[PDB]
Design a protein around this ligand. Structure first.
Ligand SMILES: [Zn+2]
Ligand SMILES: [Zn+2]
Lengths: 142, 142
């Protein structure tokens, strides 16, 4: 009764998934590389704080998701590009408004966010790109 | 009396120009490469048609701009990614709603669109990327 159901294959729409994954693999690894190149230690403190909150509050699926949002928001802010920031917010809003436990991959999820933070702190653009790509692939594999 | 004037340096805002150029250099060369990789001959016919209309109607600054829009729209459609298409449309709308003769660089503009079309037809992703980058640099140099 909603047109989205009429134009998208239910549960698994491969073409939309591929379009989304292509856009994410373009934009988010670039964000990660620019964060590694531009984040200051005050930016790092905001990312690390949200990472620690994710680690600590991985039990209730509301305080963790609240801390996951702050992590990506701190990563995005460390790029210091308001246009890119709005674009990535639009991409993430579309992803959550179209796509459908999360505890079953909680250990892998925390490790991926730690690896992205470590690459950003190390100012390693290649490692940050790889961490972002891994996160997108793990998000897609669900 | 409009807040945009209050938060942006008039005529030339270097930080917004750099943010815009970074976003465009990320997204539009990728669009160009994917067009070179994915466009069909029916896609090529739509791009070539708009290119010829630009060439023919380069005199009145309304039929040319009408044909310039159709060129970029045909390039975008040849990528066959609706998410990327909406993102690039949002970027282009922001560019025209924020930024300010065009005959003085008409010859260079037509040559750049011809070079992008040639790269797309040749399915040369590197050449299409370079043509897009050149177009963005020439747009910025104004
Ligand atoms: Zn996350
Ligand atoms: Zn043009």
């Amino acid at each position: 009764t909603d047109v989205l159901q009429w134009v998208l294959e239910n549960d698994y729409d491969p073409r939309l998934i591929s379009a989304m994954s292509e856009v994410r693999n373009l934009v988010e690894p670039a964000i990660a590389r620019w964060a590694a190149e531009r984040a200051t230690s005050s930016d790092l403190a905001q990312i690390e704080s949200a990472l620690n909150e994710m680690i600590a509050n991985n039990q209730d699926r509301e305080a963790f998701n609240e801390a996951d949002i702050r992590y990506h928001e701190a990563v995005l802010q460390s790029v210091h590009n308001p246009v890119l920031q709005q674009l990535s917010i639009a991409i993430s809003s579309l992803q959550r408004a179209v796509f459908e436990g999360d505890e079953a991959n909680m250990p892998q999820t925390l490790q991926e966010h730690k690896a992205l933070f470590d690459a950003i702190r190390h100012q390693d653009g290649d490692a940050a790109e790889q961490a972002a790509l891994t996160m997108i692939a793990s998000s897609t594999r669900r």
